[PDB]
């Protein structure tokens, strides 16, 4: 019961590496339960635009999304080293616990 | 057999005017159980006319800012006021609302001209949907201002206001202001 946990700020690299990891685990046919899409946390900081406070008080709205996914599989726990060597694309980082 | 509030037949009441026949929506398609519809009706020109007349009546009682947004309070007020109509007069109350709105829309009115602040007014006549909603506004004034400071509560005052426009007594602020803002259009001619 080893669960690999993926996190990024963009959806497309995370979707490519999750598709590649389930393709590498469906080619060897371990039991893989599919990607479980955890809800996105928006970090929003709403600051004022003007550096001295003189104008017509227009406000500025920043945000950043965190996309949080996982794959869970039942296997021997040293077979699991060979799948996480194809997943080294930037953005997405991998946290593994048992 | 769609009955209003469970108890009111809509099959029998008499619109005695031609001009408001498509502009007081009370008859068989617009028979609904409740004065709440939660509608999308004021999203186009002339979809607000074929909102039911009872639904416009309970929404126009939401008017001042202490009572803004509160609909079921006026559903309760119009429920007890209709029961006050059935107990004080004992006729079908939908004829009382129809008679109040048909009788109290002012048929002639005045417009301001004179280039924005020298007063010479000109008389023209009123469109029937403007007559219907002007009648509901002159019926919801009166009753709130005549139950603002009184020992009388609102439901007797509103049902008596619809009675007092249904028979045309000149204590009725709908009928009193109807005669006044048509007689000044008589005067500026």
């Amino acid at each position: 019961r080893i669960r690999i946990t993926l996190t990024s700020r963009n959806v497309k690299s995370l979707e490519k590496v999750c598709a590649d990891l389930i393709r590498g685990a469906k080619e060897k046919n371990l039991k893989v339960k599919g990607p479980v899409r955890m809800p996105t946390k928006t970090l929003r900081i709403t600051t004022r635009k003007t550096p001295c406070g003189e104008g017509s008080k227009t406000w500025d709205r920043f945000q950043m999304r965190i996309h949080k996914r996982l794959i869970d599989l039942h296997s021997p726990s040293e077979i699991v080293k060979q799948i996480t060597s194809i997943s080294i694309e930037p953005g997405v980082e991998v946290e593994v616990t048992i | 057999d769609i009955k209003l509030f469970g108890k009111w037949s809509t099959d029998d009441v008499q619109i005695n005017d031609i001009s408001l026949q498509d502009y007081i929506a009370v008859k068989e398609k617009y028979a609904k159980y409740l004065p709440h519809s939660a509608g999308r009706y004021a999203a186009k020109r002339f979809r607000k006319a074929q909102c039911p007349i009872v639904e416009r009546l309970t929404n126009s009682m939401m008017m001042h800012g202490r009572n803004n947004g509160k609909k079921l309070m006026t559903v309760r007020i119009v429920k007890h006021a209709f029961e006050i109509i059935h107990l004080l007069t004992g006729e079908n109350p939908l004829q009382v609302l129809v008679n109040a709105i048909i009788n109290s829309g002012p048929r002639e009115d005045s417009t301001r001209i004179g280039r924005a602040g020298t007063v010479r007014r000109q008389a023209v006549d009123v469109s029937p949907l403007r007559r219907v909603n002007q009648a509901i506004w002159l019926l919801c004034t009166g009753a709130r201002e005549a139950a603002f400071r009184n020992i009388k509560t609102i439901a007797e005052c509103l049902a008596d206001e619809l009675i007092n426009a249904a028979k045309g007594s000149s204590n009725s602020y709908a009928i009193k202001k109807k005669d006044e803002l048509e007689r000044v259009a008589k005067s500026n001619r």
């Binding site: - | 007890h80 029961e83 107990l87 020992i151 009388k152 509560t153 007797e156």
Partner: protein, 70 residues
């Protein structure tokens, strides 16, 4: 407004001999013509339903409605 706090001696024949001949009996009905408080209206017009000459038509926390029993 100068209202009665409790009933006077010749108020009971007014309460019993005018009021069931009225068309609509609410707690806002008697106090205009009697100069009484509305607490007398609610308590006394509730007590007449045990005398059985009125019928309760509606009950609410703000508005109570009674009438003649024919």
């Amino acid at each position: 407004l100068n209202n009665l706090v409790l009933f006077d001696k010749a108020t009971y024949d007014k309460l019993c001999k005018e009021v069931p001949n009225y068309k609509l009996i609410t707690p806002a009905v008697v106090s205009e013509r009697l100069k009484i408080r509305g607490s007398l209206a609610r308590a006394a017009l509730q007590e007449l339903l045990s005398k059985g000459l009125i019928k309760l038509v509606s009950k609410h926390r703000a508005q109570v409605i009674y009438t003649r029993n024919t």
